[model samples]
Each structure stands twice: as structure tokens, then as C-alpha cells.
Target: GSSGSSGKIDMPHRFKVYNYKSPTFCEHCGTLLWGLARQGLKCDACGMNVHHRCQTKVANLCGIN
Candidate 1:
């Protein structure tokens, strides 16, 4: 299909409620984060939260990071 002049691609999918409830810490960096929210996960150790985009960097998954 031809690219739309609007320069917009298929929108990214949103997360469901289940993801926010079962968040885990990053395996490599040990950052506690919310997976489904697609934002910073609440980290008790760091005294703050870290965003998924910031934690993952290139990886798409956050359950293990």
C-alpha cells in the first residue's frame, strides 16, 4: 500500500488493565516498572518510578527487562 501523505502509520496498541497489576522488576537493571501502563513503573528501591521506554531502550518487553 502507498504511504499516506499524513506520514502516519498504524497506531500502537494500548495496554489492558491486567498488565498494571502484575508488574515486575527489570532483570538487567533491576528497575521496578509497570508493564502494561507503558510508562514508569513504581520503584521502591530507587525511591521513584522509571518509564518503560527509558528502561527498555530497544527491547519491547518489560516483564523481565
Candidate 2:
């Protein structure tokens, strides 16, 4: 393999999703976060939502400084 970076890391404390819900927009695709169910990652830090497909492309990880 090409050393694909597929290591999972614990959710940063600043970006933890305390609550998960639907009807949010995908930060990467700018689409609805959930169509029929709670879809992608819901960044509780800034309330930014993103789909699993775009988890790697989304920007601003809970506003890391």
C-alpha cells in the first residue's frame, strides 16, 4: 500500500458531538447532513456537520489552534 493514513484517533475534546441529530448540512459537500437518519459527523464544537465520505476532506477540526 502507499502508506495510506487510516489511523483512527479519539475525537478531540473541542469537537466532540455531545448530541447527534439529523437535518444538518455536510461541511464538505454542503448537503444535508441527514436525509432519513442522523448522517455524518456533527461537530458539537461549532455545530458543523459532515458526511463520513467527506470526513477526511472537511476543514476546521473543532477550531484547533
Candidate 3:
């Protein structure tokens, strides 16, 4: 059997502690997330990387692209 069946469910974003090596910006605030590690949260499904403070700010815009 093949994977995915060529479709993405596009559910709500599920975020996790994202440790970025390079600089990353918040999708909500559109500002830089400053930290050495665990800089922000990244959607396990959609890649909606954003700052901790902006987590609530980025609600509803989750899932895959």
C-alpha cells in the first residue's frame, strides 16, 4: 500500500518545543524568536513555527499547507 493516499486532513495545529539552530520568525507576530534552543513551537503537521508568546496568537491556523 502507498502512503497518505495523496491527501492531507488539515487538522488543527499541534505544536511542540522547536529548537532551531538558525534564526526563525513567528508566523503570528511576524517577529524573530530569540533563544539558543527551544526558541518556539512548531506544528507537527503544518510547520507553523512560532514564538511561545505568540502561541495563542496563532490559534486556528494549523494543519498542513
Candidate 4:
């Protein structure tokens, strides 16, 4: 496997839809989140909150960090 980059930590971030109870904002674009369920996409491995549109702009290198 000539130094294959697949181990315990594989491409971190691992974001998913989160229904935050408290009012929050996107950590990427910095925008207030509204609604109940589907407020925005949140990193399950990390606490990075962001809108669906801003997901591509966030630094998702180390979700554990």
C-alpha cells in the first residue's frame, strides 16, 4: 500500500444536518441560523457550524482538532 493516506483519521470534518436548539450561526460565512430541524450542516466530529452553501469554504482538515 505505498503510503496510502487511509488510517484512523480519514479526511476529518464529517459534517451532517443538526437541529440546534439554541440560536447559532455559520462558522464559515458567519450567518445566523434560523428554523428548527435543518438549521444547517454541522461537523459531527467537530463543532464547526455552517450553512449548506458555506460547507465548501470551511477548513475541514482536522475535525478532531
lDDT of 4 at 65: 53
Among all candidates shown, the one with the greatest TM-score? 4
lDDT of model 4, residue 28: 73
- For residues 9-62, could you state the per-residue lDDT of candidate 1 as single tens digits? 332222222235555554446666644445444443333344545444423332
- lDDT value for candidate 3? 0.72
Per-residue lDDT tens digits for candidate 3, residues 1-65, read 87656653434567889665877877878988778768788878777787776876665645434
The number of clashing residue pairs in each candidate reads 4, 1, 0, 0
Q: Give the TM-score of candidate 1.
A: 0.25
> Cα RMSDs of all predictions?
10.4, 9.0, 5.1, 4.0
TM-score per model over all chains = 0.25, 0.45, 0.66, 0.66
Q: Candidate 4, residues 1-65: lDDT per residue as tens digits?
A: 57657556536567789765887778777878786889888777666777887887766585445
The candidate, 1 or 3, that scores higher on TM-score is 3
- The candidates, ranked best first by lDDT, are 4, 3, 2, 1
Q: Is candidate 2 or candidate 3 better by lDDT?
A: 3
Consecutive 10-residue window with the lowest summed lDDT within model 3: 3-12
Across 1-65, the per-residue lDDT of candidate 2 in tens digits comes to: 78668764444423333244436666568876544443456666656656666666755445553
Model 4's TM-score against the true structure: 0.66
Q: State the displacement of the C-alpha of residue 23, model 3, in Å, after optimal TM-score superposition.
A: 1.1
Lowest-sum lDDT 10-residue window in model 4: 3-12
